[PDB]
């Protein structure tokens, strides 16, 4: 039934660019909508990767390992799975290891890789990969981890159980103001669901 | 230590506008993003999104997911149902109101997150994730009505929670539709629990 007519460019910035997308409804009428892309999506399957990081360790419950930052759109501190761009080029699984890396100090394993998902398919085209890596805590390379953040990048990291992982973020609101991200909720909730 | 210092307009349009937001980083440094954000917000968050769990005696218990045509993605996608706020309305009463008029199904608030952001890196959107239990084998679900909007054309596809990720792989490989995000972080926390 429905397909994409036309893509009109309205504003390009730097990284980030606003459309008017006309399209075809399945009623046979045309429709348009205002459309957010990144300037940055070459051949990648996906703008991004997010990355859940399960660090394991002897006599420890696993934890979910998190990054805190600063975000300019929401003007404040945000808690999210470490996240970045995948350069072009590189592969979503070396995408998330290098992301995972450079955020928290931690040396992953590759566990499981999602397709390209949407972050907010009625704004943006926006995709990422999610991808699962363990990060074995016990190994000598992961035991006082640095990060390694690039230019202007400041990022803490915050470890909480994975057995109790919904409460403690709702700890972490209640204490300061800061947002955590919709995919973290979502992965917490389901942890509790279950 | 980082905080905004200003918002210039960029473009807006009638749903999506884009700013560029100076901010002062950590080290003291000033510094510039490219900041999408919606025209609509008034309340809590932008939106809502509704983990609706299906519940019927002598069945798996299925999470009920939407499929719509996404301009900004220029395919279908598969998500939680969803919608923006109307102006006075609560997150639990959006959820509601979003769930019948998507899906038909008339449910009970079982909790709602706070507010958790869709993109930080790109925009401010936010939503309250609203927990919903649909009661199955009550008379108003047995032939759920959809209400669907003037330009809203919704499918419905009621999956089984205790399988959710292995079905949505599916549909992703045969259907070619993109999953949300956050449906693919509930669903991978599904079998990551324990
Ligand atoms: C029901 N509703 C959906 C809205 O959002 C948009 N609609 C068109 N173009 C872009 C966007 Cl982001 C506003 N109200
Ligand atoms: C590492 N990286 C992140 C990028 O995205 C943006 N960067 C600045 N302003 C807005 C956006 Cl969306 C580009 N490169
Ligand atoms: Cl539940
Ligand atoms: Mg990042
Ligand atoms: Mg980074
Ligand atoms: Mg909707
Ligand atoms: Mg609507």
Redesign the pocket.
Known sequence: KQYIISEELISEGKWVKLEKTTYMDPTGKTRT??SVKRTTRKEQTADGVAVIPVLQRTLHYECIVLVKQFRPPMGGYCIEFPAGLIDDGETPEAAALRELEEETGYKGDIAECSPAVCMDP??SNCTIHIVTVTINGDDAENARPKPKPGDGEFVEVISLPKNDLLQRLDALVAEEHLTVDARVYSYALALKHA
Request: charged fraction near 25%.
């Open positions: 909508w205002e009625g704004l």
